[PDB]
Symmetry: D2
Subunit: 491 residues, 4 copies
């Protein structure tokens, strides 16, 4: 039993989905299109204009112009704040449309898209609306003969690329901080998930964003992706997605000495210590990995359990795994949707095979589910060791690896022995051991007796090969900023 389609999403899917360049909704200069799918049913869900290299130079020129002259270059910070703020309101106004688009286009459940994704995107904008007037430089006291101050100047035209797992919320992670600073934007959504953002384009127009401040260019990584990465007149690039493609972007960026920001993958450890509150910790371990179908860079894909509790938690995770209600995002019953694509499904089925072939046991799941659509069963793997492919590599599906350990110093050593370092979970009732452990984990975010919490105000990012830089909080601003130290001789 189904969620009735919102009239505005009907009217929107009923037509070719246009790109948004220089204030206008447009086709690709050359007329190419591509299809996005409903991953639950595998039908074409919409036909979308495809940005080629040439649509990207157009988007760069519009952003370059909006950055140098016209209202965006001349507004006070109070006016810019006010724009970002009205955007937040219109989005909030269209919350149901956007959540349906996310459910339909990404696959995730409607009600979680609404409660989590949409509300976070709104609040992110609202939080960044707030920074615009508060991005301060320094005055530095050095000597009587000089006034010394710094300016935090927006770097300019920003190229941003985002993946398909939290489409709209990620557009906001990118654009809220970049906009707060006065930059202009050329942003490409993922091929699997363009609809969320191109719908939101209506909302930027209604809010009154001047022409060119924001430019949305959907398409493929080798064409629209590359053309952004390689553009001579883009001042800075931010990317989230595969550790692999990150390497590429940094390499390409070398050429222009362009600042890079990278939010990449993870194999984040979720540590249940001997004195954890097991009630809570089991739920955390399960939510840790299963939330968004495991399609989450910071998923707790390695669940470490003290030996005392090992069997209890395996038994619980197994029971909860076989209980998940799989089905369509737009069906009210659904607890976990399908994976985003056929390719994504095949890759995680592959990993499960490698798991088996390496000698690990599947204690639940391990295979596809349902009649059509890209589903996989929640999977729990057991009898696992540290050097196994499934324990080392990011799978990006509802697949968890559970790992006994015997001492605190041991679990920190094994949690840290990864070139990933996005996130980590620690479950202990003890005040001393919670901080001591959090301190010693090499990870950008540590939750003590929780997991998977994000907020506009708290920075998020990787150590080691999980990333360069932070997004969210005050920290994300520095990425979009170029520091100028002015010395005024006054002797």
């Amino acid at each position: 039993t189904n969620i009735e389609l919102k009239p505005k999403v009907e009217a929107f899917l009923n037509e070719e989905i246009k790109m948004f360049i220089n204030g206008e909704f447009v086709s690709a200069i050359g007329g190419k299109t591509f299809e996005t799918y409903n991953p639950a049913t595998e039908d074409v869900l919409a036909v979308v204009c495809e940005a080629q290299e040439e649509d990207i130079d157009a988007a760069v020129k519009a952003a370059r112009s909006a950055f140098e002259s016209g209202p965006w270059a001349e507004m006070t910070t109070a006016e810019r704040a006010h724009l970002i703020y009205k955007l937040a309101d219109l989005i909030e106004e269209h919350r149901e449309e956007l959540a349906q688009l996310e459910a339909l286009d990404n696959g995730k459940p409607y009600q979680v898209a609404l409660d989590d994704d949409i509300s976070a995107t709104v609040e992110n904008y609202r939080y960044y609306a707030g920074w615009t007037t508060k991005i301060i430089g320094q005055t530095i006291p050095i000597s009587k003969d000089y006034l010394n101050y710094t300016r935090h100047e927006p770097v300019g035209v920003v190229g941003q690329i985002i993946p398909w797992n939290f489409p709209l919320v990620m557009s906001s992670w990118k654009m809220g901080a970049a906009l707060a600073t006065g930059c202009t934007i050329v942003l490409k959504p993922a091929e699997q998930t363009p609809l969320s953002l191109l719908y939101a384009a209506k909302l930027f127009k209604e809010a009154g964003f001047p022409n060119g401040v924001v430019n949305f260019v959907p398409g493929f990584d080798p064409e629209a992706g590359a053309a952004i990465v390689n553009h001579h007149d883009i001042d800075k690039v931010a990317f989230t997605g595969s550790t692999v493609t990150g390497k590429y972007i940094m390499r390409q960026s070398a050429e222009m000495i362009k600042h890079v920001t990278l939010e990449l993958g993870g194999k984040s450890p979720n540590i249940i210590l001997e004195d954890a509150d097991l009630e809570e910790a089991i739920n955390g371990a399960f939510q840790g990995i299963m939330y968004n179908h495991g399609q989450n860079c910071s998923a707790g894909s390695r669940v470490f359990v003290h030996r005392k509790h090992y069997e209890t938690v395996v038994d619980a995770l197994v029971k909860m795994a076989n209980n998940v209600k799989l089905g369509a995002g737009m069906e009210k019953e659904t607890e976990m949707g399908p994976l985003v694509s056929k390719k994504q499904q095949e890759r995680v089925l592959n990993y499960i095979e490698q798991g088996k072939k390496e000698g690990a046991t599947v204690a639940a799941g391990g295979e596809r589910a349902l009649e059509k659509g890209y589903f996989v069963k929640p999977t729990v793997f057991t009898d696992v060791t540290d050097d196994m492919t499934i324990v080392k590599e990011e799978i990006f599906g509802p697949v968890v690896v559970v790992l006994p350990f015997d001492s605190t110093e041991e679990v920190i050593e094994r949690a840290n022995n990864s070139s990933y370092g996005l996130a980590a979970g620690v479950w202990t009732q003890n005040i001393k051991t919670g901080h001591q452990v959090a301190n010693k984990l090499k990870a950008g975010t540590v939750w003590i007796n929780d997991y998977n919490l994000e907020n506009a105000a708290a920075p998020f990012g990787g150590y080691k090969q999980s990333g360069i830089g932070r997004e969210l909080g005050s920290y994300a601003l520095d990425n979009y900023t170029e520091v100028k130290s002015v010395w005024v001789n006054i002797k």
Copy 2:
């Protein structure tokens, strides 16, 4: 008349010069040595142990181990501040020694190595010892169910590579900020100028630095340099030198998703507007380019002159160029010493040639000077245009191009039309013009009615191809930190 050699610099130079690894003075593991020259006389100044890849490896291991355990991992921020402070005192103490080594090894005049270099380095250390206790994170008010806090953790083992133009002071730009955050160090000084730093090693030992906190690995870019940029166990990398080599570093760093900071070359404009205080602006224009033999990334290598004053400044720059007293850095009368090497003298005479062949006029200088040593005459070029190699590329010598202009909007445009953006100078008595112009120039440092000022407390660095990141100031600390977001569930 010669500056008399210091007893301690004589003893140091009488022996093979050792590397500094894990608290110990040592030879290269394979016993290789290389020679470093006195650029005034072309003699061998010293023989120096040469670090190979395996030496770099021993430096990383010693750094990794001083980072994870032992006194440096365990001491309070106050004990760390004190070490850095005592270091600065010890340097102040051996100031004449270090100044002679800079005169001898690098070439610059003794007195200016004493008053500028040694003194700035001492001051940089003292400024940074002050940060150690004040490196602060946030507590973030989000919700009554969580304590949210960030930690600024040292990134770990830091690979650092510096050039030959301000050898000691440049070692402090790297080490001050890094050590202040708790980081550990493997640092390579330039093949041309290893002595300052290797002498200074005595002082880190004497100050009581724990073993392996700091490691000094003299040698070549293809060997020691590459081994640092490629090492898998180095967490972060910092480099200053050619935009050329910067690109290579950034590209290799991509493999490991390693954070990079780059301080690179410039073609910095020094702009003399109509209402300049002309007597002042003339000296700033001459000093802007001639200071340190023009071997200065932020040299005012393009002097822009409002047309009314163009002839006047040229004549002055010519008369001044021809009066500089060239000689050995250890002779008392010397105002400008030799260029650092035969290679550098060739690169610069070459640029001058290209200058002549593209139609520019050599108004003063234009050739080598004296019987021996790597000397080039201070050089003034007129009848230049924006598209000339000599006006577009970094020469890295005492060579200046003078350009007339007719309007402020014109000179703004022409100053900015460059891939570089390290520094700029503007001279004007007017309150509005000063800041308007400063705001409009794309440059990491803008001096209004001054030039070439640096201080520990003020960040320095390039826009565009002049770099990524900042050194000095609070800002430099961010380069050596990883931000950890901790969520403490208190529901």
Copy 3:
């Protein structure tokens, strides 16, 4: 002639004006009422419920209980930020009603209350709405054995008392910062101008403020004001008004060791140096004193003019003083309305007399104007000396004193020679002088080539007897915060 009453101000004025306690519009417990006047006609404007000691108690209990429990105490910073922003929207929707109310009740011209007062009140609440999410504390690295962190906790219930010269805007200076930290508020408007704020009360309720977060108690200083400064359960106090009463408030606050923030009077200098753009400076000097009929603690009430220009600026100010069009605030052609009260007209006419008695000359104005109304003619005094009453005391009317000077060193001395230090203006085209002079003036804000500019983002407050603390900008938050330093032993 006349601007017609808005329907909603008509409805509001046909009725007894109710107070606002604990989310309810109420009468005084004892049912007392008082009158407020149109200063243009002397007519009764409205009758208003009069808060007594018992009404303050009821207000404080409601604020205390809204601080300790219920939605305001539970809600996230995001929700709290959102309430403050919806408030600002409503104030903007009612912009015309609020401006009429201000013109009618305080006396200033409608157009300026609308363009200045209301828009600045909107912008102040928009600005602080952004802060609630960014009131950050510190994590302080001291020793591995501890976690150190500080929380900025809201002080609690705060008592705020404001004057009559900018009634609504001044309510936002106090409440914007206080509410952003999560404090609750008991606020008393001036007896001359309660209307704005009590109309604004609808808007707090309609925006969804929880019961008791905000409580408005109109009345008199000996009853309602006194009950506020003396109340044992009010945690913190903030006042703006005469230096005299500030003294009283600070004294009284000593008995409870209560943080005080005071915003008081001035005798601010506006200084025209030899190389000023004389045209902009003349206008700047005239607006500086004449804006808001001189009822402005930071009015440029001593105009210092370099000798070469004295006569020119005296002529122009006399002519300008003679030309201002005096009229009711609700007549469309009026440039300056009347002073707020009979008492105020009397005090300033008295100052004028005194000025005359001490041997100063009245170059313009110096007497009442029109048939009815608390009007006073814009007034210019010449032949003044530094120890005269009129040049030392705050007059709070459209009365200015013009003094010649001969050197920069001289005018700095004379400007600073005052117990006041609220503000200062300097007019010069020279980049050195503008900064030199502004560095040496003892004033909380200094305008170089302008005057009377305020913005939510820039701090305002006085040196010496002009006050304690700052309002506006990030700085104002500190006044409403109590710093907690937490030590977590993790040994």
Copy 4:
């Protein structure tokens, strides 16, 4: 028996001079007063006595040093250097300063050396580092203006400090004020002027230009009032009794002088049911007995969960009777005398008042030894919230121990006080520690510890325990005026 350092003997062999305008001077009118050794009750030294006219010479010297000459023209680096040189000298003279503290204040030598001197050295080192990092803001409002703020030194500051940590308290005051570029008129307590007056040599030697610091010993109604009421002092800072604080703020009002106050307390130290009991017992005991209880943030109220009450009472009584009482300059002393006759009497009198309202003295409750201002460490039992000794700052080694049955009950009883200086929480639970910390109305909260202070971390009172914070970056704001500059560039 610890022997006098030769430079300490030299210092005490002479009348003790004030320090004004870089000069060691006698009082203009020639008055002197005595300071005593509170272990032996003999005069320890005869000190020049500052009168109103001396404070007035000090303010002039200070005003002049702020407004012109080297202290007003130095780079922040030069100024930092002077502060660091001071810290070194203090460290060089650590044994001398420690002995003076032990002799003048009464505290044990080893503690004076290990705590007081090292803390004061650290404070100056810490603040020397700030002088270069006192930054203001550049504020992006509009393109027509450059907006920036300067954090300027407020000017000549007036500082008054108590006798319980004489040298460290001179640093909490001077460190942050000097870092901002202010100049100083400082009065040490009449009971303990010596450390400061010795340290004055080190300021001169470090190269402080004349009149940057000026030290004026004497009495609160003469030198003290002169400072608070002086027309040319820009700002005032005081630490001492809640009562003198009211007077200070009261007087300060007349000139709209910024006040910073650090005052008394009755701080709770709360042992919950899941504390580590061995650790919480030691902390409860140190928390009150450290520095003989003459410590505004002494945990003078120990709340114990009912389950553990009798256990901790037993241990506190045992440890209270174990402390070794004696002279500060004697090798084995763990706790010395109170600072004066008047203090010893105030405290015995609080003891009487507790007995007579019905509390039981489970240990101590009377003077100790033949001569000197000693009182036995004292533990109070059968106490209720209502009693004098439980509401009022006693300021001696006297603890009151109270049972509680619930976390809500103890939080409310801890908070039910006009004080809020500090608090301690003992519990092994991660949630409970931060919830409780969050709820206590107190400027610093220690979780599983007590009495920790460090130059980096703010210290200060809620409610009547003070206004403002000292230490940390926070302290700088008290010594600063914020100037907001607008530059029209339209």
